[PDB]
């Protein structure tokens, strides 16, 4: 039981670090969506 709870705690910690990593990835992807939105903005403005 002690081995189980210790491995469980370290696994929950690793899962928390993974959640944070994926959160940074999601933020970067949202920034990419904003950049592509601005790209389409200037592209359709380039119809002129």
């Amino acid at each position: 039981l002690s081995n189980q709870i210790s491995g469980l705690n370290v696994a929950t910690r690793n899962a928390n670090d993974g959640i944070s990593l994926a959160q940074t990835a999601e933020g970067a992807l949202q920034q990419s969506t904003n950049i592509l939105q601005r790209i389409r903005d200037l592209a359709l403005q380039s119809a002129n």
Binding site: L42, Q45, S46, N48
Partner: protein, 49 residues
């Protein structure tokens, strides 16, 4: 959770909204939707020409 608070997303949002508010303030005080500033460089060329 005491060494830091994750509420700084609200700080980011208030910063962005203050930028938007200053831009709209400029737009209304000069009467120009596109400012004499950087915004809409193509529209800026059209306006200068």
């Amino acid at each position: 959770v005491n060494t830091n608070i994750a509420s700084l997303n609200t700080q980011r949002n208030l910063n962005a909204s203050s930028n938007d508010l200053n831009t709209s303030l400029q737009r209304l005080t000069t009467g120009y939707r596109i400012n004499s500033a950087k915004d809409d460089a193509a529209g800026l060329q059209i306006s200068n020409r």
